[PDB]
Amino acid sequence: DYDLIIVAASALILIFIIMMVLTRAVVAAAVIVGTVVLSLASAFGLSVLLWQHIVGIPLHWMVLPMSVIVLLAVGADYNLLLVSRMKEEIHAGIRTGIIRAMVGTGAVVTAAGLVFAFTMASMAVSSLITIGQVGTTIGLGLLFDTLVVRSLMTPSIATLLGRWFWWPQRVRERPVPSKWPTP
């Protein structure tokens, strides 16, 4: 119990510091961390269901911290990749920037996330069932993160916050309107 608390706190603080340093923004780092935490809760629920209710073998007492320490980091990495692309595409307007960033990264990030999830889930063929439980929990977590948090939650929050998503940096919501081109 105490180790799980310590690991969660330290990992969250370190990931927040790294994201704040890289993106040069506070609100973006907070959004990344919060979305990852929510995905973590969903992952725990799915894994508990799949094992305890379906299979019948409850989770081992050491599955939770091992799963958490990896889910946090990998989810944060994927969100960081998307946000980093968004920052490069943002000079054309927040909404168009988000659309271009999603079109650019989506396939790559989906392939990487699926590969990671199916690599983790392949540990279930082990004779030791604790390792299988850890692997399947991390796999379900990354699956849910990739398919929901990055695809829907993060860009929705970025659109809703608007210019506050990049605080304390100063960002135009939309560019200066331009004259129609002459053919």
Binding site: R95, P181, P183
Partner: protein, 81 residues
Amino acid sequence: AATQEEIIAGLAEIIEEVTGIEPSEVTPEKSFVDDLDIDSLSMVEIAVQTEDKYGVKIPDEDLAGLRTVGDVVAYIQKLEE
């Protein structure tokens, strides 16, 4: 205001980015649903791009009404005037 040619050129560039249809294909008598084969989601993407570049806001209810390129050009000119 802006001439029909300028609006058509800008919309053709945006449509090229969104869908890939070449600008030469976009003529004011083309129907989005049939001639150009553009679904409603692509149309709302075009509206978002237009609002973020030229500052023209097109609500979804109006997007339902618009049928051909000429209709969109007329709508934009009406807003400008």
